[PDB]
Amino acid sequence: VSTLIPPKVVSSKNIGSAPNAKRIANVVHFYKSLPQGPAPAIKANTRLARYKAKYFDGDNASGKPLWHFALGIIAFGYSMEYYFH
Amino acid sequence: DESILLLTFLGFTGLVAKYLAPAYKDFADARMKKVSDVLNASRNKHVEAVKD
Q: What is the DSSP string of B10-52?
A: HHHHHHIIIIIHHHHHHHHHHHHHHHHHHHHHHHHHHHHHHH-
Method by which this entry was solved: cryo-EM
Q: Does B33 touch chain A (CB under 8 A)?
A: no
| CA atoms within 13 A of residue A10's CA, in its CB half-sphere | 5
Q: Do A63 and B49 make contact, defined as CB atoms within 8 angstroms?
A: no
Say what the resolution is, in angstroms. Answer: 3.8
Q: Distance between CA A50 and CA A38 in Å, rounded?
A: 19
Q: Distance between CA A63 and CA B21 in Å, rounded?
A: 6
Residue A8 DSSP one-character state: G
Residues B25 and A61: beta-carbon distance below 8 Å: yes
State which H helix or E strand residue A28 sits in: helix A19-29
Q: Distance between CA A48 and CA A55 in Å, rounded?
A: 10
Q: Does B41 touch chain A (CB under 8 A)?
A: no
Q: Do B13 and A81 make contact, defined as CB atoms within 8 angstroms?
A: no
Write the CA distances from A77 to A70, A85, B6, integer angstroms. 11, 12, 12
Q: Do B49 and A23 make contact, defined as CB atoms within 8 angstroms?
A: yes
Q: Does B50 touch chain A (CB under 8 A)?
A: yes
User: How far from each other are the two terminal CA atoms of chain B, in whole angstroms?
Assistant: 74
Q: Distance between CA B4 and CA B28 in Å, rounded?
A: 34
User: CA A15, A18, A20, A21: dihedral to nearest 10 degrees?
Assistant: 100
State which H helix or E strand residue A77 sits in: helix A64-81
- Please work out, in degrees rounded to the nearest 5, the angle formed at the alpha carbon of residue A11 by the alpha carbons of A9 and A13: 100
